[PDB]
Structure formats: C-alpha cells, structure tokens
C-alpha cells in the first residue's frame, strides 16, 4: 500500500535517499533484503513514468 | 479555462480516507507519461477517464 500510494516526486527523492544509503554502505549490508524489496517493487510499479522521465543525473544514480 | 483529461488507472487500497472519497492514480490523457494522485467522490473503476481543473496540485490524505 505505502509504496503504491507514494507519488512520483517522492519516488525521485526516495531514489536519492537510496543513493545516500549506498554511500553509507554499512547500513546497506545491515539491511540488504528490505532495501532490495522496496527498490524493485517501487520501480516495477512506477516503471513507465520513471522510464518516461529524462535526467542524466537519474541515469548516473541508477547506474 | 484550460481543462485537462486524466485516466484513472488503479484505485488505491487500505488508505485512510473519508467515506465516499478515494485516493486514485491518474495518468494524463494527452500526455501519456505524467501521473498525479487525486481524490474522487463518485463510483469508479480502473481505466476510465476524468476531467481536471487543477492540472498541477498533487493530493493528500483527508484525515
């Protein structure tokens, strides 16, 4: 429910948050599963809008 | 007055709303990428289009 109802700008903010987490790598390994589930489900739901957007910064960060 | 057309895609669930109004995800009809969340009052199902005045302001919970 939560990840579904989350609107698109907040999706973008959430992606930048995950970027910050990866830089805070230790938390990444402390909570690997939950982050994976969140990320894959959010992108698999908002998939079409996210691919529709155009941002080289977004390209780099998803890389 | 610039009217806009949106396509109700997927009716949200488990959301704390009021009786008879619903959070719902709409996809712009002439711009098949942008999505917004709006509040609807009548009955509705997926995949059906709707008229909007406020083409920009995203929506909130209504306590």
């Amino acid at each position: 429910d939560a990840l579904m109802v989350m609107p698109f700008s907040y999706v973008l903010k959430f992606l930048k948050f995950i970027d910050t987490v990866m830089q805070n790598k230790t938390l990444l390994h402390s909570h690997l599963p939950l982050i994976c589930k969140n990320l894959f489900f959010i992108i698999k739901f908002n998939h079409k809008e996210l691919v529709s957007q155009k941002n080289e910064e977004l390209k780099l960060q998803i890389n | 007055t610039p009217v806009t057309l949106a396509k109700v895609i997927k009716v949200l669930g488990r959301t704390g709303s009021r009786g008879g109004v619903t959070q719902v995800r709409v996809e712009f009809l002439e711009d098949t990428s942008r999505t917004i969340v709006r509040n609807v009052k009548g009955p509705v199902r997926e995949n059906d289009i709707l008229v909007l005045m406020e083409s920009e302001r995203e929506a909130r919970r209504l306590r």
């Binding site: 429910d1 939560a2 579904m4 109802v5 989350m6 907040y10 | 959301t15 704390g16 919970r61």
Partner: peptide, 11 residues
C-alpha cells in the same frame, strides 16, 4: 495520529 505510507512520505 498518521497513517503508514504518509509517515514515510513526511520522513
């Protein structure tokens, strides 16, 4: 109080 989803939204 608040509901889930929205909680994460403000946080």
């Amino acid at each position: 109080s608040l509901k889930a989803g929205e909680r994460l939204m403000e946080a």
